[PDB]
Amino acid sequence: QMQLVQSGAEVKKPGESLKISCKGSGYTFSYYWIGWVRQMPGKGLEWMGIIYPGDSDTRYSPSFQGQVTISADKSISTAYLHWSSLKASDTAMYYCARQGDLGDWILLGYWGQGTLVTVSSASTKGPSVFPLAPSSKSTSGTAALGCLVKDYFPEPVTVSWNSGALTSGVHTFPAVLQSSGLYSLSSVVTVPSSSLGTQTYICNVNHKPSNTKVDKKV
Amino acid sequence: QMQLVQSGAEVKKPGESLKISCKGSGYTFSYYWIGWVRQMPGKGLEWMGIIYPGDSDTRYSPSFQGQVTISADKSISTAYLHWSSLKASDTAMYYCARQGDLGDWILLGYWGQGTLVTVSSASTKGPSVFPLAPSSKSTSGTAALGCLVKDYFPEPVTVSWNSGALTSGVHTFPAVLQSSGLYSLSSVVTVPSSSLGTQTYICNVNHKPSNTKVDKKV
């Protein structure tokens, strides 16, 4: 079966080299043109260039001639995308495409999984969890308890309740990019007012890039 | 990452073919010239020939035109070095080199690990230990006891005292190449004259190519 597997998410700082990869399998990796497509958040698709597995016949985009170089390894059937002197405007979603059994040579009928590439001048910093106390002065309606996750550079942050319990009522809201480059999200749970702290009502926030296990109740 | 891996050590006899290999990875094995360099023990480097992975374009050394043939397999990206009718003078170290991204086409900037070939067609004689008795007729000075290792073809021979004890005083002298092709060394130890045979003063000579465990005291 033909499929394209890419590398994991790479987060770096401006002024640092980067070389992502995208391996294709299930077909003869000698005759199908491999290319890369850039997609900025909220923008359309942007084509940068294509390569040939047999010989490096690189046809770069007129706006990406010397700004980026593309290469591949025919011995392992894996294409690469090397960068040099990254800028703040280079953070976008990149895909790898290949031609199909029918159509033109730049039809790009197949696609990949997508590699999330983000760059920012801010460095990693452990999040500070603040327990969002419910409206204790006005219990009219339904109680809502949660915690405030703030001051963290990496966007992927998983938040659970009671080591994964309390599935119903919990709604995780996506974070927002502040001016300082640090994100901040909020997760609450809809619980009855007469059930304040049933077992523990404790927050569970995990952060893999910093390895910070913070558990605090409210 | 670019790296060159070679085959293990091969020990054969003259009159038998030999075909060592050296596989290169981490780069496109179609445009970099692959060659072999011979290095005799105690001598300098000797170039034999080079090959091209794309097509068969072999340029051998004028002293190694028909004495050795070089080939490679582009399908698996592995270079080979085949021999025919080996002689006693073919015992040397062989490396595989490749050109870099800069320089000439025969610069050979990268190297491998090394494949040691040794034939040395002779008669492997078992070492006969002869305990060198000290000067019992003249004890003036310091006593010196040792054993005589003689009649052995392989040069590497390890000699210890009391299973590795008595570190101080023991001085091992390198062997000498006799006319018959057999080496001979001698190892003694400086001991006080009043301490003749402290514990045992026993020699310990080991020979790996012949598996002879000879232990004799004096």
Add this chain to the structure above:
Amino acid sequence: NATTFASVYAWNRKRISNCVADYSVIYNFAPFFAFKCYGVSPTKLNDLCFTNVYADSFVIRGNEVSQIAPGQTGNIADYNYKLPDDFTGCVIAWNSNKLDSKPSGNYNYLYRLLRKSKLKPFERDISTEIYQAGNKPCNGVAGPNCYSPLQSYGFRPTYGVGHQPYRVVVLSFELLHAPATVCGPKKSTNLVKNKCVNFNFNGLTGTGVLTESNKKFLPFQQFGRDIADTTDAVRDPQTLEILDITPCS
């Protein structure tokens, strides 16, 4: 058999003198892309002599081999290397994509993309000055009106046949009747006198009679022609005597 030749604008010329012309060592190489002699035949060089033979070495992008010829125009033909209309020699060009090309890009060759005027035949212009194309006086730096005239090549083995680096060797020899030193291993015989026999001193074949006249030839003169441009007197290469070529009965 050289690892790297010279640049196009800096083509090196090798002077050859006192040689034994044996071109059989060149035919055993790879099949050349263009082996065309404009004044002689390639199989006749071993039976002739040369007064002054020069060898030029330069590497081009392959498809420009048609520009190294008399009466041709182009970038290299007008800026780097030009052949005169009266050129008498041979052109040797073969593929060198395995030697003078790198997978990452070989930037050791220039071709002088820009130049003020057309270059004359058999000249070398290695000036690295900035080509001033505009009206403002260029101060030797890159600007909107003056760029770098020396551009680098993009020799890569991934390109097909035609864009690969091709080493071109131009053999410029002089076959004019003059005292020469390069004749080859052609053997010598005995010098007979007063008889109708053949003669071959420096490739001049024919039939005549030697008379050994008292003509006073100068050191730089060996051959002499009559009104009809027929060589009637020659100087022996070995002996310093003068021998005339008179027709037989």
Add this chain to the structure above:
Amino acid sequence: NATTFASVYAWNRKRISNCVADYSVIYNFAPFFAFKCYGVSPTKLNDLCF
């Protein structure tokens, strides 16, 4: 700079008029297997009138 041409029996003829005769840009294209002219010389190409 075309992706796909036409068939052999349906070869397309492109009329060229009201433009500049600049054949020097063709030399930097992909290498040609046979560039032979039957009426003029290839280097007079970008000089003549058509």
Add this chain to the structure above:
Amino acid sequence: QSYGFRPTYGVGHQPYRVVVLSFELLHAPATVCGPKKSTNLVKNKCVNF
């Protein structure tokens, strides 16, 4: 001397079959004409032959 014909060698050392067809175009009885077709033999009239 024998050849070293091997498929590993590139252009310049591979075996190439060469066939030389020597013909004789002088006026003489020929029997190796090209196929074609025989027509009628007309006479006493200006025709092609």
Add this chain to the structure above:
Amino acid sequence: SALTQPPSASGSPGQSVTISCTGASSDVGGYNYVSWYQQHPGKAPKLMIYEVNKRPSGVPDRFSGSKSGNTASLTISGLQADDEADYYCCSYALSRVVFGGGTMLTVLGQPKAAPSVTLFPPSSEELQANKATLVCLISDFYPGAVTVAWKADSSPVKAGVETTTPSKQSNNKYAASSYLSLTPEQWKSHRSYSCQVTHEGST
């Protein structure tokens, strides 16, 4: 052609040394077809200095190269302990690489010493058999130049004698060993043999 290199070089840490390389060919391409390689004992060589007007990446500025005519020079500014290796020069002008003889790099020598005159009589286990071998041990001497001459009661005998001068250890001094093989009946026919060193004087 073949390249010529000195047998060995010596230099104290901190000073500079120069390695000569004479015999480099030339062609119509240039005269800078000289490269240097460093191979430590027990590993593959490594390209240190090539195209002496330049230098590769990852190589410190301590290694410098030059060339004057047909003689090449390798200049090393700072000498350290990890620099003791064999340095070879290569000429690749006429489409043919040729490696020189080689030169081993080390540090300055050691003042002179006195050799040993250790001589053992023929061991009984080899004497009683149909064999005999005289073993003379010479060591603890700096100058690696010594010829062992055997004598049988003031009579020079040089039948079946071999002697070398190897290096013992990093103590900067050399050693020596000699073996005189003869018949056991010859040993009992005269008195005890003598071992002469002839290092600097009669000893």
